[PDB]
Amino acid sequence: IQDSLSSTASALGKLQDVVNQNAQALNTLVKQLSSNFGAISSVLNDILSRLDPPEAEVQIDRLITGRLQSLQTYVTQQLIRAAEIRASANLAATKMSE
Amino acid sequence: YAWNRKRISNCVADYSVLYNSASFSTFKCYGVSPTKLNDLCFTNVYADS
């Protein structure tokens, strides 16, 4: 077994998979800030520095709408994965106890 | 149809006086607010007459 683990790294795919999944989802969430959602630009400060309050609001509305919508979607993925992982955790606990 | 094309760059721009020049009938901005005009830096500008 010591040799098997030392040579082959495919055994730990499951744990590697979970870490990759969370990293992937987070990266997409981070990347989403680069999106425009039909706005003039995707830099909040730039919009504040170009238009005026009665004019910059519409752009912000799209930025907030898109960004807020993206966040909850990521939140949903996390908890669903958490729902799965927690189920896995309970199974492991029984294996430990049993 | 023969609208002139002009280029301006490598200089400082004072739109405040131009904004204060209310003599112009049509002084409208779309991508920017004239109030904020005097506080932005640009790669270059194009002017037509």
User: Nearest C-alpha of chain A: how many angstroms from B2?
Assistant: 30
Distance (Å, whole) CA A79 – CA A66:
21
SS3 B36: helix
Identify the residue among A43, A47, A51 best suited for mutation to test binding to B, counting B beta carbons within 10 A and taking the highest: A51
Radius of gyration for the alpha carbons in chain A, expressed in angstroms and rounded: 22
Distance (Å, whole) CA A37 – CA A55:
17
Across the interface, whether the CB atoms of A40 and B31 are under 8 A apart is answered yes
The total of other beta-carbon atoms located within 10 Å of residue A51's CB is 21
Among A62, A41, A65, residue whose Cα is nearest residue A51? A41
Experimental method for this entry? Answer: cryo-EM
CB neighbours of B36 closer than 8 A, spacing ≥ 6? A49, A50, A51, A52
Distance (Å, whole) CA B40 – CA B12:
11
Distance (Å, whole) CA A84 – CA A87:
5
Distance of CA A70 to the CA centre of its chain: 9
Burial class (CB in 10 A: 0-12, 13-18, 19+), A50: buried
Distance (Å, whole) CA A59 – CA A38:
8
